Each structure stands twice: as C-alpha cells, then as structure tokens.
C-alpha cells in the first residue's frame, strides 16, 4: 500500500471567519490527533470532538484518545492546515495549550482536558455545531494523579451506599497541581472502568500473595526499632498492629 | 394468532441513473498550480500532487 | 408468525425498565381534565380482620 | 413597490442584501517510484548491452 | 459577521437578478447565509467611524 | 430459559470477550457471516409490534 | 555567518564526489578499484552479520526470518542463534503434523543441541531469547553467515527486491476482523502451566493497537485461560513462585494490504507461512505481564 504519511493537509468545509483563521495561525505546532491518517484529511476528523458521545464519559475518552494519531499541527494558512506526523526520538516544539506550566525536563503525557469549572476559554473554533476539542499535554506527575484519582473513584464506587459516593466523587475530581485547580469533566463510572477495577483487584490481589513473611515484616520491625515522620503516616494506614 | 399485529417495514435499494442538468457559468472554479510533495520509503519515494 | 420468533422473543421487548424511565421522566400531566384520571390510592391492608 | 389607494395601508420600500460564499474542495493523487526505477535513472554501471 | 453599509456605499456593479418565489421569500426562507432587510431608510449608511 | 430461548429461536451462543464488548459498544462489528450462497441480493426487514 | 551562508539550502552527499573520489582528484592516483560510486550507500538499514553454523541454515536460505539468540550455561557454547522455525518444535500452538513435518527438517547436531539446551532450564524460556532481526544475504557455505537487519526494511543489495518476512502460518494470529491501514507485528510467547512442565505456546500477533495498555487488555481475552491456569497454578503449589504468562515485544510494523499466505520450499518440503511483504524492523523489548 501506500506508506504511512508524514505530511497531511487538513481542508475545513464551513464558512472560516478571518477571526477563526486567526485562532489556528496561534494554534500552530499543537499536539492534534487523527484517526485517519490518510494524505488530504477532512475537517471532521480533526481532533477529538468526533468521539463525544452521549454517554458523556471521561474514561471514554481516556481510552479512545491513545488509539488516535498524534499529529503536531504545522504552516497553518488560509484554505489549508499542514499537520505533521512526528518520528520518533526527533526533537520538537510543542505549544503549551493548557494552563499547566512545563518544568524543564518533565515529561509531557496526553489527557483529555479538564475544565477549569467555573471558566472556559471563549476561542473555542466551533462551527457547524462542531466544537474544536483537543487533548491537554500535562506534565507526568498531573496525568498519574488525574488516573489515580478515576480509579479510586471507580474502586470506591462499589460496596459503598450511593449518597456516600456522591460525597467521595465531589472531592476526588478535584485537582491542585502546581497551585492550579482542576476538575475531570462528568467522570462515571462505567464499564470501561469495570474491566479495570478486575485487572487492578487481580494485581493487587495476587501481590498480596507474592511478598514474602520479611518482606511484609519489615515495617513492624521499623517501627519498633526507628521512628520518623513517615513512618508516623505509615502507622496510621496499618489500622490497627 | 397472539394477541398484536406487526407492521414490518423494510427498505429496498435500486440501482438507477440520473440525469444532472446545470446552466452556464453556474459556478466559478478558482484553482492554483498542483504541488508536489515528496516522501522516501527506503525502498520507494511516494509522490502526491 | 414463526419467522419474527428471532425479535419478538429478545429480552429488549420484554424488558419495560427503559420505558418506565421516560414513563416517570415526564410525569403526570398538567391538564385539568387528566387530573381526573390521575388520583387513585392504591393502599396496603393487612389481612387479619 | 405598487401605489396604493384609499383606505388601504401604502407599501414601504424594503432594501435587501445577501451574500454569496465560496467552497473549499482539493484534490490528490499519488504516484510511487521504486528504489530500483531510481537507481538506475541516475546511476550508470559499467556500460553493457 | 458581513458589514453592510459599506455595500450600500461602494459602487456596485448591477445586474439583472432572478429568483423564483418573490426576493422577499427567498430572503425569508433563508436561502443565503447573510441577509439583512430595512424598511425605511436607515440612517447607518451616512454614519462613517 | 435462555438456553430454552436461543434453542427455539435459533441463534445460540452469542458471547463475546469484554474486550470485544467494549469495542462493540462502538464500532459494532460486523457479527454475521454471510449465506453460503445469496441468488438474490441484498436483504432486511423491520418489527413495529 | 554571512547571510547568505544560512539562505543556502541543505546539501546532499550525492551531489558532492565521493570522499574517496575527493581525494583521488586532489593527488590523482588510480587505483584498479572502481571508487566512481560506492555500493550501499543509501541504506537506512542497520545491519550486523552473524556467524551461524551450518547445521542451523536450513530454513533460513530464504532472506526474512527471526534471529534470536539463546543463552544456555555452558561457557563454550556461550549462546546459538535460533530460527523462529526451529524454535517452533518446541511451541504447543504448531500443528502435530507440521511439528513432525519441520522435526525431521532439523536432524543436525547443531539444532539437536537446541531441544536440549531449550529442555534443560528450569527457568522460563521468555528470558533466554533476544530477538536479533531478520536474514538476508546468506552467506550459505560450511558455516553461513548471515547478515541480520536491527532497523529499517529488508530489501536487496541495489534495492532490486524487497525481502519479505516470513512467518509460519500457525503462529500467525489476526484479534481483529477489519484490517486497519497499517499494523505492528508483536511477538508473544504465552507459557501454560501444566505439571511437569510449563510448555510455551508461540504467536506472532499483527495487530493496528500500539498502545501498550490497550494491547493487553485485548490479548487477556484469548489468553484469559492460560492467565486462569496460572492463577490456579499460583495457588495449588505452595512456595512456588511462578512469572508471567505471556510477554509482548514489539517487532516492527507492515501495512496489512502486504499480508497474504505463502509457502518456504526447501528439501521439496513446502511449508505454508504468511509473508508480510515490506516488513520493516523495529525491534523493541519483551514486556511481562499476568
């Protein structure tokens, strides 16, 4: 067949105002990803608006957002969009599209975005009752927490009465990183996180059955021989002995 | 006989021809110069105009 | 009739949860005169006496 | 706009605009060139039959 | 959005229109994106910001 | 009962990875291998009780 | 730093002479050599050449076929380099018949030793192998050597051909139903626990997933029964500290029109395997997981 493309022309069909034009010639090298990956792109498959859906999950999106085509957008003009598929190990710009601010040398991850609640950004590109989304690049330690916190919601979920949930998922969809304050938009439990609550449940079940009589020992005998301000925390999440 | 009726519906294709008439200088069709982008596949080069 | 056996026996038409959701949803009517036809009170009584 | 006569409500004028648009539609088409048709289009061996 | 006034300023050309169905219905039923209809005579083309 | 059912109406056995569940629930897969031999063409119907 | 010296556009080596002719245009000698043009000078291919003795080149006088080298112990034989083929006797997903078929394929010393280095370790066979790349060019003499790609498409010397991968048929395994345009290779070898012994069952799995993630939570579907034998493995022996039961590496990637059915003719022995044709290489690393 013909090979993987590396340049990609994407042609918008709507009416563009020459003030919308001028959103995508500032949106210029960011992370946008395609399906498709074929030479002359429509418009519609740009970007991650095409998967919304009624259910509106996030871990939906979570998930169907790694399978699409990472693209960073490149020589923006009238009439034409040039995105770029990028090679492996070769350096690039990338835009900080989200409110997150980049350490040097942190790793960058792909997270659908996450409202800031109370604002959102008015230069949306939406035309046609077709909204531009794109996915939020967040440093590493943000996109971790932003997974830890959907699956403890999602472990939470089960064996616990319903009005309890309510008030452990009005807090665990809160953010602070980096002082910001963040919120996953309509996080539901699902069945995409079900088959996740069973390989998490059988991991963590079968590391209970893996560690040896020292191994799980060795906090006990810390405990009683030292002390530090760690292991005061570690005391209290043992329960009781 | 159960107590309800059906009522099937069920669509039915047919390949047709068609005739289009448009009149003159309908439309104007501004074009450019074709451009040729090239790229190398090791073991070919690829070219798209 | 025994041709539709493969969806006249599928749980989905045997199932009204969907449809007591949208039965509940928009409840009862505002009209006068379906008011009517609104108040009955279906009322548990023990059997004893 | 037609004069009107008496007892009747007169016409006012009515100015109208509107706007035409155009439409965006490329087009591409690929042609592929092995490596050997290219070897052999620049490079010459030694000059045999 | 499309600015009028300057159409109702600058010379235009002049042509002789046809569309079925009075211009005033086919301003109506929304045959063109853009569209704008005043009756008397509004005094926002003589105003120039 | 279910076993009852597919064994009257004919199909069995439907059961699918929930991996491929949760796909389905998407792209739909095309879950139906075609008659060994079709003279007529292209089929559907449709159920309104 | 002039103006112009950045205004210049990007010089190719072939529009310069050869380093060689360059210098031979300064001092003018003439050497019998032909240094006009340089062989192999366009070759995105990472290459290495590995000696491989005789009794293992059956099989892989075919250019495209997996190298992989096997540690075994003994300090003399320090490694051998295992065919995907040869590795196949061993594998509980081949057919019988083509098992008994290849076997006899296989009757040299050289590969003997493989059956019994592969049987000797209690340890599992996922971590003695490294996959290598692929053949081409053998050398084909008492003792072949084989030059193995790590990186790029394999083709011929003057890219007259490209060299295709060949895989045979029972490994080869497609999840899906509807192809995508293009699609990554992964090799996976699945241990099922069994008494005696946990025999391997190998596959090559073509599939459009690249994330990690998403690949494996499709592969626990068809080997929901090896994991649940492992599981159950886990608890009906005591101090027994079973690993992971399969592992993924990556292998590289082809464009899934290329993939059709073919067969390896060799000893009047054809030999039905599936070839993906412009197969680049791109190895990766075995990734464990339950």
């Given at each position: 067949?013909?090979?993987?493309?590396?340049?990609?022309?994407?042609?918008?069909?709507?009416?563009?105002?020459?003030?919308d034009?001028?959103?995508?010639?500032?949106?210029?090298?960011?992370?946008?990803?395609?399906?498709?990956?074929?030479?002359?792109?429509?418009?519609?498959?740009?970007?991650?608006?095409?998967?919304?859906?009624?259910?509106?999950?996030?871990?939906?999106?979570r998930?169907?957002?790694?399978?699409?085509?990472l693209?960073?957008?490149?020589?923006?003009?009238?009439?034409?969009?040039?995105?770029?598929?990028?090679?492996?190990?070769?350096?690039?710009?990338?835009?900080?599209?989200?409110?997150?601010?980049?350490?040097?040398?942190?790793?960058?991850?792909?997270?659908?975005?996450?409202?800031?609640?109370?604002?959102?950004?008015?230069?949306?590109?939406?035309?046609?009752?077709?909204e531009?989304?794109?996915?939020?690049?967040?440093?590493?330690?943000?996109?971790?927490?932003?997974?830890?916190?959907?699956?403890?919601?999602?472990?939470?979920?089960?064996?616990?009465?319903?009005?309890?949930?309510?008030?452990?998922?009005?807090?665990?969809?809160?953010?602070?990183?980096?002082?910001?304050?963040?919120?996953?938009?309509?996080?539901?439990?699902?069945?995409?996180?079900?088959?996740?609550?069973?390989?998490?449940?059988?991991?963590?079940?079968?590391?209970?059955?893996?560690?040896?009589?020292?191994?799980?020992?060795?906090?006990?005998?810390?405990?009683?021989?030292?002390?530090?301000?760690?292991?005061?925390?570690?005391?209290?999440?043992?329960?009781?002995? | 006989?159960?107590?309800?009726?059906?009522?099937?519906?069920?669509?039915?294709?047919?390949?047709?021809?068609?005739?289009?008439?448009?009149?003159?200088?309908?439309?104007?069709?501004?074009?450019?110069?074709?451009?040729?982008?090239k790229?190398?596949?090791?073991?070919?080069?690829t070219?798209?105009? | 009739?025994?041709?539709?056996?493969?969806?006249?026996?599928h749980?989905?038409?045997?199932?009204?949860?969907?449809?007591?959701?949208?039965?509940?949803?928009?409840?009862?009517?505002?009209?006068?005169?379906?008011?009517?036809?609104?108040?009955?009170?279906?009322?548990?009584?023990?059997?004893?006496? | 706009?037609?004069?009107?006569?008496?007892?009747?409500?007169?016409?006012?004028?009515?100015?109208?605009?509107?706007?035409?648009?155009?439409?965006?539609?490329?087009?591409?088409?690929?042609?592929?060139?092995?490596?050997?048709?290219?070897?052999?289009l620049?490079?010459?061996?030694?000059?045999?039959? | 959005?499309?600015?009028?006034?300057?159409?109702?300023?600058?010379?235009?050309?002049?042509?002789?229109?046809?569309?079925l169905?009075?211009?005033?219905?086919?301003?109506?039923?929304?045959?063109?994106?853009?569209?704008?209809?005043?009756?008397?005579?509004?005094?926002?083309?003589?105003?120039?910001? | 009962?279910?076993?009852?059912?597919?064994?009257?109406?004919?199909?069995?056995?439907?059961?699918?990875?929930?991996?491929?569940?949760?796909?389905?629930?998407?792209?739909?897969?095309?879950?139906?291998?075609?008659?060994?031999?079709?003279?007529?063409?292209?089929?559907?119907?449709?159920?309104?009780? | 730093?002039?103006?112009?010296?950045?205004?210049?556009?990007?010089?190719?080596p072939?529009?310069?002479?050869?380093?060689?002719?360059?210098?031979?245009?300064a001092?003018?000698?003439?050497?019998?050599?032909?240094?006009?043009?340089?062989?192999?000078?366009?070759?995105?291919?990472?290459?290495?050449r590995?000696?491989?003795?005789?009794?293992?080149?059956?099989?892989?006088?075919?250019?495209?076929a997996?190298?992989?080298?096997?540690?075994?112990?003994?300090?003399?034989?320090?490694?051998?380099?295992?065919?995907?083929?040869?590795?196949?006797?061993?594998?509980?997903?081949?057919?019988?018949?083509?098992?008994?078929?290849?076997?006899?394929v296989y009757?040299?010393?050289?590969?003997?030793?493989?059956?019994?280095?592969?049987?000797?370790?209690?340890?599992?066979?996922?971590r003695?192998?490294?996959?290598?790349?692929?053949?081409?060019?053998?050398?084909?003499?008492?003792?072949?050597?084989?030059?193995?790609?790590?990186?790029?498409?394999?083709?011929?010397?003057?890219?007259?051909?490209?060299?295709?991968?060949?895989?045979?048929?029972?490994?080869?395994?497609?999840?899906?139903?509807?192809?995508?345009?293009?699609?990554?290779?992964?090799?996976?070898?699945?241990?099922?626990?069994?008494?005696?012994?946990?025999?391997?069952?190998?596959?090559?799995?073509?599939?459009?997933?690249?994330?990690?993630?998403?690949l494996?939570?499709?592969?626990?579907?068809?080997?929901?029964?090896?994991?649940?034998?492992?599981?159950?493995?886990?608890?009906?022996?005591?101090?027994?500290?079973?690993?992971?039961?399969?592992?993924?590496?990556?292998?590289?990637?082809?464009?899934?029109?290329?993939?059709?059915?073919?067969?390896?003719?060799?000893?009047?022995?054809?030999?039905?395997?599936?070839?993906?044709?412009?197969?680049?290489?791109?190895?990766?690393?075995?990734?464990?997981?339950?």
């Open positions: 067949m013909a090979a993987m493309e590396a340049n990609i022309f994407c042609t918008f069909d709507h009416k563009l105002s020459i003030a034009v001028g959103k995508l010639t500032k949106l210029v090298a960011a992370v946008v990803p395609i399906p498709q990956r074929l030479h002359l792109i429509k418009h519609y498959q740009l970007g991650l608006h095409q998967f919304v859906d009624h259910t509106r999950g996030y871990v939906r999106l998930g169907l957002l790694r399978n699409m085509t693209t960073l957008m490149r020589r923006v003009e009238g009439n034409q969009i040039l995105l770029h598929v990028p090679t492996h190990g070769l350096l690039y710009t990338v835009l900080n599209t989200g409110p997150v601010t980049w350490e040097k040398g942190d790793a960058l991850c792909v997270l659908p975005p996450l409202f800031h609640g109370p604002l959102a950004r008015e230069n949306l590109l939406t035309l046609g009752q077709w531009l989304v794109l996915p939020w690049i967040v440093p590493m330690p943000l996109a971790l927490e932003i997974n830890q916190r959907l699956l403890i919601m999602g472990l939470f979920s089960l064996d616990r009465s319903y009005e309890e949930v309510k008030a452990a998922v009005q807090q665990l969809q809160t953010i602070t990183f980096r002082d910001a304050t963040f919120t996953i938009p309509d996080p539901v439990i699902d069945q995409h996180l079900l088959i996740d609550m069973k390989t998490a449940c059988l991991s963590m079940s079968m590391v209970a059955n893996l560690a040896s009589e020292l191994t799980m020992t060795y906090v006990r005998k810390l405990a009683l021989e030292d002390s530090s301000m760690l292991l005061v925390k570690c005391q209290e999440l043992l329960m009781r002995l | 006989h159960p107590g309800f009726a059906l009522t099937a519906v069920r669509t039915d294709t047919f390949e047709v021809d068609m005739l289009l008439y448009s009149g003159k200088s309908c439309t104007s069709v501004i074009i450019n110069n074709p451009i040729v982008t790229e190398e596949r090791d073991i070919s080069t070219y798209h105009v | 009739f025994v041709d539709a056996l493969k969806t006249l026996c749980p989905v038409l045997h199932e009204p949860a969907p449809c007591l959701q949208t039965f509940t949803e928009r409840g009862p009517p505002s009209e006068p005169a379906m008011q009517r036809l609104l108040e009955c009170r279906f009322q548990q009584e023990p059997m004893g006496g | 706009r037609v004069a009107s006569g008496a007892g009747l409500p007169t016409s006012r004028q009515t100015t109208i605009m509107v706007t035409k648009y155009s439409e965006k539609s490329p087009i591409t088409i690929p042609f592929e060139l092995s490596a050997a048709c290219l070897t052999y620049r490079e010459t061996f030694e000059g045999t039959i | 959005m499309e600015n009028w006034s300057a159409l109702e300023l600058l010379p235009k050309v002049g042509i002789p229109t046809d569309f169905t009075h211009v005033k219905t086919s301003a109506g039923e929304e045959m063109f994106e853009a569209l704008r209809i005043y009756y008397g005579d509004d005094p926002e083309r003589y105003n120039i910001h | 009962v279910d076993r009852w059912i597919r064994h009257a109406a004919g199909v069995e056995r439907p059961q699918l990875l929930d991996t491929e569940t949760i796909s389905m629930l998407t792209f739909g897969s095309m879950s139906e291998r075609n008659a060994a031999a079709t003279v007529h063409g292209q089929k559907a119907a449709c159920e309104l009780i | 730093m002039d103006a112009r010296a950045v205004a210049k556009r990007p010089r190719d072939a529009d310069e002479d050869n380093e060689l002719v360059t210098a031979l245009k001092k003018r000698e003439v050497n019998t050599i032909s240094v006009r043009y340089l062989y192999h000078a366009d070759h995105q291919a990472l290459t290495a590995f000696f491989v003795p005789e009794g293992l080149v059956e099989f892989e006088a075919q250019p495209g997996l190298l992989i080298r096997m540690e075994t112990g003994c300090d003399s034989p320090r490694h051998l380099y295992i065919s995907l083929y040869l590795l196949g006797i061993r594998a509980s997903n081949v057919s019988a018949s083509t098992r008994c078929l290849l076997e006899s009757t040299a010393s050289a590969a003997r030793a493989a059956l019994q280095w592969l049987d000797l370790g209690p340890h599992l066979l996922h003695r192998l490294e996959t290598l790349g692929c053949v081409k060019t053998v050398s084909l003499g008492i003792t072949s050597l084989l030059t193995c790609v790590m990186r790029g498409y394999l083709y011929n010397t003057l890219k007259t051909e490209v060299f295709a991968l060949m895989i045979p048929k029972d490994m080869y395994l497609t999840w899906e139903e509807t192809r995508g345009r293009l699609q990554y290779v992964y090799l996976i070898i699945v241990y099922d626990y069994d008494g005696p012994e946990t025999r391997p069952g190998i596959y090559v799995l073509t599939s459009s997933i690249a994330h990690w993630q998403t494996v939570d499709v592969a626990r579907g068809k080997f929901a029964r090896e994991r649940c034998s492992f599981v159950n493995r886990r608890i009906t022996r005591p101090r027994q500290i079973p690993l992971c039961t399969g592992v993924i590496q990556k292998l590289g990637w082809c464009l899934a029109d290329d993939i059709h059915t073919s067969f390896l003719v060799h000893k009047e022995l054809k030999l039905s395997v599936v070839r993906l044709d412009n197969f680049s290489v791109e190895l990766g690393d075995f990734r464990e997981f339950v």
